[PDB]
Amino acid sequence: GVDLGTENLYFQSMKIAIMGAMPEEISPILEKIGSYKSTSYAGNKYYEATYQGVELVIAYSKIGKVFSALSAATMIEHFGATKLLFSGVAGAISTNLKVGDLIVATKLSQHDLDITAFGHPYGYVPEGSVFVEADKDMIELSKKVALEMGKSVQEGIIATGDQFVANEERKNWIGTTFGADALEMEGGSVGVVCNALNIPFFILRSISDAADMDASFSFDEFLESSAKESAEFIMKMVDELVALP
Template identity: 50%
Template structure:
């Protein structure tokens, strides 16, 4: 990957980008498409930061705006997710290897769950950005797990629904934006990676856990992404 001059960073909610925005003493902003895009700078690296609002449609709109209007060369998503894998605890960090739209169902037409004609079930994260994330984790001596992310327009708090994502997609976490921005990035040949910190366990206690641990988990993910940005700002290439 060549030297990155402009990178986009996304969250879904204000709580997911606030910890990152707080690390910069100066910024400018631009409103477009009922959303705000913050312009930041870290040495010579230009950063465009935005929260999309919750859900796949908003994530796709924001990702496309970052790519087409702000001309970002890569995109990092930082946020929280519901844990599906039994080895994930609250505040654990997960790096997506690939992502799927788990609520797409064209099985009456003999397609597998999550499949869209002329597309695919999964979209894969960028290997070089993921390698950077793993290098940061190693340098910080911070556990970073890898796995599949299931994306759907639903806050999952039902154990049966949770188990279906594990069985059908091998997913480790579930959230509401990642695959959407991933497919947009793939369509425009823009590398991306998605980092999620576990805020709940996607079961009956999920709403209470989410409210209790949202800020803590968002801070974990934002802190990690900031170190990635520092590395990008000082690197000649990945």
């Protein structure tokens, strides 16, 4: 076998899944890529593109843990993704996050997963883990990108559950129990699936609201702008991942 050392500039095996939960979260991705095909599968549409020597598979999952698990599994198992990036919006728990701020997940839990009647901690089931770890290399890359962009990007724990949280008491329980800086409805599900399949993943969220009584209105106001903020950063990540030595 002969490899000349430049093959990756022409075509490599890497296939990057880029996912959101809602159409507003991925359309800015599809606008940057511009040209792509689409496949109807698993009740959804999966868009594919040839991008600078790698291939992209892009989709929105629909909301929640089950749909996001299905899309993540589909992108890996059926569309052959080898890395996964998630872009979307989230509710802020930490007071240092405000509308529009980006947060990269260090690790994620499922805040509504509860078999505590058997004395296990919140978020745990046998053979599982309270937290699932996002990929360290991509987190480092995100630091490089943030500086290049001149942007302030926090790193923290994101908690995932199948509820839109619009209630400070719930919000505070989640923050306290898990040390979570932000909450959302897909990240931890996606992480568990990627982890199961040995696929490194990266979860990015732009804050849309503060998970309180005003959460739904803020979410409506800032969905499009926050979604665009996340998506712009994610495309910079893709360009970086294509550039690896």
